[PDB]
Amino acid sequence: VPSDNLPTYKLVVVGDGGVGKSALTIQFFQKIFVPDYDPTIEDSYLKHTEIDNQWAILDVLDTAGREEFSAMREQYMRTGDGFLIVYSVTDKASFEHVDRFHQLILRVKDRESFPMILVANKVDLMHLRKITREQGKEMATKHNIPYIETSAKDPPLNVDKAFHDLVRVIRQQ
Amino acid sequence: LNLDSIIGRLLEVQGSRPGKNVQLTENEIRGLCLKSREIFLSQPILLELEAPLKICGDIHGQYYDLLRLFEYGGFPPESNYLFLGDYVDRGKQSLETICLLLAYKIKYPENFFLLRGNHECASINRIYGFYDECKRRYNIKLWKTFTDCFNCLPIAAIVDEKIFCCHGGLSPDLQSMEQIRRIMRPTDVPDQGLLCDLLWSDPDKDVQGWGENDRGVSFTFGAEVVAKFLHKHDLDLICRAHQVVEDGYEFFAKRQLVTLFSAPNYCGEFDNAGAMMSVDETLMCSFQILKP
Amino acid sequence: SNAEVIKELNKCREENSMRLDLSKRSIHILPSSIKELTQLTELYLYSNKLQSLPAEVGCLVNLMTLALSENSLTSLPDSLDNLKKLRILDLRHNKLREIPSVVYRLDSLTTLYLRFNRITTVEKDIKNLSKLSMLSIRENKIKQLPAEIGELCNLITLDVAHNQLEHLPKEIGNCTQITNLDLQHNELLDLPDTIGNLSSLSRLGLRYNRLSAIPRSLAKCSALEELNLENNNISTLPESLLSSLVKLNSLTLARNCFQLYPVGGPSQFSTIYSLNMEHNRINKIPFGIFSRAKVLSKLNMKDNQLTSLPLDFGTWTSMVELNLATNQLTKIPEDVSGLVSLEVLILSNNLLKKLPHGLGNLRKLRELDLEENKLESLPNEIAYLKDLQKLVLTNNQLTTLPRGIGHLTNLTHLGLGENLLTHLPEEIGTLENLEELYLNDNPNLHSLPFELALCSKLSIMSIENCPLSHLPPQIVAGGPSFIIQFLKMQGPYRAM
Ligand SMILES: Nc1nc2c(ncn2[C@@H]2O[C@H](COP(=O)(O)OP(=O)(O)NP(=O)(O)O)[C@@H](O)[C@H]2O)c(=O)[nH]1
Ligand SMILES: [Mg+2]
Ligand SMILES: [Mn+2]
Ligand SMILES: [Mn+2]
């Protein structure tokens, strides 16, 4: 049972198309894995949840990763308090594009740094994985941001941790 | 699928003494599940409906009590219907109850609507009867076919912009209607969160805001929650079910919420009437009491 | 707060800012003073309670984005005519019963979102919006599209999913730049042969329609990466479709009318990684069908009419996941030993009474699901399945477990419910990783081994409808946490 006057954390999920932003978000809120791909324009989700025994409202904005779906993405990102930058470990181009999203966040928010976590998704796909844990920790250290590996597929790996850790980053800044 | 023949045989036992089964074939029933499933997925998870409309609460497999409801309200398509969930479990003829409802859904898909209740869920109706009834009269494969179908049922309805209907009630997380639209199907009902609360929560007069629920799942919500919700979304009424009420229906929060229960003398332990609510062209409601 | 709204409007003209964000402010009526802010190029009014837009918005003639998602709009003012630089118009999640007539005159538009309204008709005036590269009108009640759709020659994405379409106009073939065509969840009885004209088509949504066949011309859409026909009325495929789709990663034929594999032989499956044929009536898998399917790693045949497996199924060495659930298999041949790369084997709802010894050679197997068979025993060789994490044996005829079960040290999930078990072997105590143990509905299970107390990670155990009469009635009435504590305290492992 949630408390009373809670703060709201606006978390924005960004990354290339098909990396699993929506599957992670839907796993996090509805606790299922959606296997069929439907590109996002924009969707949002809200929950009351307790993180480190402090009650929070998480407003999660899921953004478009496909170029032709990306109208208004900057404005939606502009409202965020923190970001999950997601790439797929099976998709080399999605990993390379982490720098572009990192740069986009700082430019949209006009800051030299900003709460963000690097999310390496789809690690359940062992035989297709192209980006190693090492490359991932290296990208995160380069940008001085946390690193986390996730899987939206059942049984889900680190999905709640990714979102909760992003709130921690926001609180702890 | 021979739809009219199925409906005929289901309606043949009308008037007979309660308990007399209807033996549809396995392939007939699986056909009902498959054809209704795709119709559920062809329609919104948040239904937007128009009056006139008859709204019914829990049936819980009281097939002969459901036949009485259609007698008073009119058999489809004489009237339009919205049921609020909990078609199976507890009663003696869950199968006949769900099959008639699915047949009507396939037959009159724009005039007959079924919401999901907390018992349209494999983990729950495994325990409270429907699994046993399926395995008795047919097989487990059929029960699992039912689960695939239930997993696609819509979750709430708004009648003419003004009456918000669901099985259970409100959620602390329900802040905009498009959150319901973002619920993906097919889906199981989770242990907590929005979809859980829409199927599981209860109003309570002794609670200020949100409270824990005796069921061990979801929440209770007070009258002030109801009032703020109605004001925010410009609604006039919440219509829900899920709780047996002595006189078939029960108002809450100065008639801003109504609980409907359409299973008279529920389980045999309760001496309760059933009720349905008729909504006319001008959104005026009327309550028909269904005698045990 | 309406106080804040007028305060933000003054701030905008005061700073002379090109962007105005009034989203999520519970605005019912937009103040007419917005007419002053003529420098705006972006106006965000999403997530409010607007039922209409004041005509003064027509004074914002430099707008390129008008964002109105999640309101209660039922029309738009004719003054929007003046917005001759408008590129993006977002009207999702509103209450429009038609495309407002003024929208058909906004010929500068490239991006139009109309999802989740109440629209029944698309007028022939849609041809006015000839610069559209993105049109999404899913989740409405459209039954027909006009031939004038073919005049949107710049379309890249057309999304008409979740409507009531029975046909596509053949003029869709004239939108040659389309790469995304989303038609899923309609009532489509066929596709036009002109669909082959869309040579750049790479994502084609067809599932949940009423298709009886696929046109042969689809073979021209050789950039298709997936073909998912789930829930249609299809029973065959055109002769050279699949081999022509040289980039096909996945093929889904689920929930159709298939009784036989599509003709064409093994070369049709040379590129796909996944084949899903669940919920059909397929009565056999042809000999040699996957001999050229070198990257096919997932095969789903759940809910078909299989009574045996092909003689060469032991050669399916690329397979990682195999679902044969809900068929009528009575045995698994010893040749299963050939699938040494298999990680997931789903065999539930069949007629199996025993398992082959060759099952023990599935060195990579992580999940084995056998619920709802007729299994009377398990082979001793299951002790060799060292990678096994999940073993589901629910609803079978098991009387004992082999003692070798305790060698499955990576097992975390063991489902033994609805069997005929009279006892659990003591060797269950070496299942060091066991987390879930389901014993419910074993009506002749009267005791549990004290060794269960060595399963230190056990956190879920079900024992409903087990008599357990050799334990104290108070303890078994208290449930699994009491039973386990009793086993710890009364057995020889209390100090451990
Ligand atoms: N195996 C596996 N598949 C995943 C995982 N996450 C997503 N997928 C699959 O990958 C596809 C794309 O996922 P989705 O969440 O839609 O991607 P997205 O980042 O939201 N795409 P977009 O930017 O276009 O909205 C879907 O088929 C989804 O089921 C994961 O962790 N593991
Ligand atoms: Mg997405
Ligand atoms: Mn209920
Ligand atoms: Mn109930």
Numbering used by the authors:
A (entry chain A): 6 to 178
B (entry chain C): 7 to 298
C (entry chain B): 86 to 581
Original authors' sentences:
The MRAS–SHOC2–PP1C holophosphatase dephosphorylates RAF at serine 259, resulting in the partial displacement of 14-3-3 and RAF–RAS association. SHOC2 is a leucine-rich-repeat (LRR) domain–containing scaffold protein of uncharacterized structure that is thought to localize protein phosphatase 1 catalytic subunit (PP1C) to the membrane and possibly provide substrate selectivity to this otherwise promiscuous enzyme. SHOC2 bridges PP1C and MRAS through its concave surface and enables reciprocal interactions between all three subunits. SHOC2 exhibits the expected LRR fold; the 20 repeats of SHOC2 coil to form a solenoid with an extended β-sheet along its inner, concave surface.
A complex comprising the M173I rasopathy mutant of the SHOC2 LRR domain (80–582), GTPase-deficient MRAS(Q71R) and WT PP1Cα was isolated and crystalized, diffracting to 1.95 Å (Rcryst = 0.1838; Rfree = 0.2209). The holoenzyme exhibits a compact structure in which C-shaped SHOC2 wraps around both MRAS and PP1Cα, enabling reciprocal interactions between all three subunits. The MRAS GTPase adopts an active conformation, and clear density is observed in the structure for the bound GTP analogue. In the present structure, both SWI and SWII of MRAS interact extensively with SHOC2, while SWI, together with MRAS helix α1 and the adjacent regions, simultaneously engage PP1Cα. MRAS is engaged primarily by the descending loop and β-strands of LRR domains 2–10, whereas PP1Cα is coordinated by the ascending loops just C-terminal to the β-strand of each LRR spanning nearly the entire SHOC2 solenoid. PP1Cα binds to an extensive composite surface formed by SHOC2 and MRAS and is oriented such that its active site is exposed and fully accessible for substrate binding in the holoenzyme complex. The interactions between SHOC2 and PP1Cα are predominantly polar, and the binding interfaces among all three subunits contain a notable amount of ordered solvent. Similarly, the rasopathy-associated Q71R mutation in MRAS, which is expected to inhibit nucleotide hydrolysis and stabilize the active GTP-bound conformation, also resulted in an increase in affinity to the wild-type (WT) SHOC2 LRR domain (8×/3× binary/ternary).
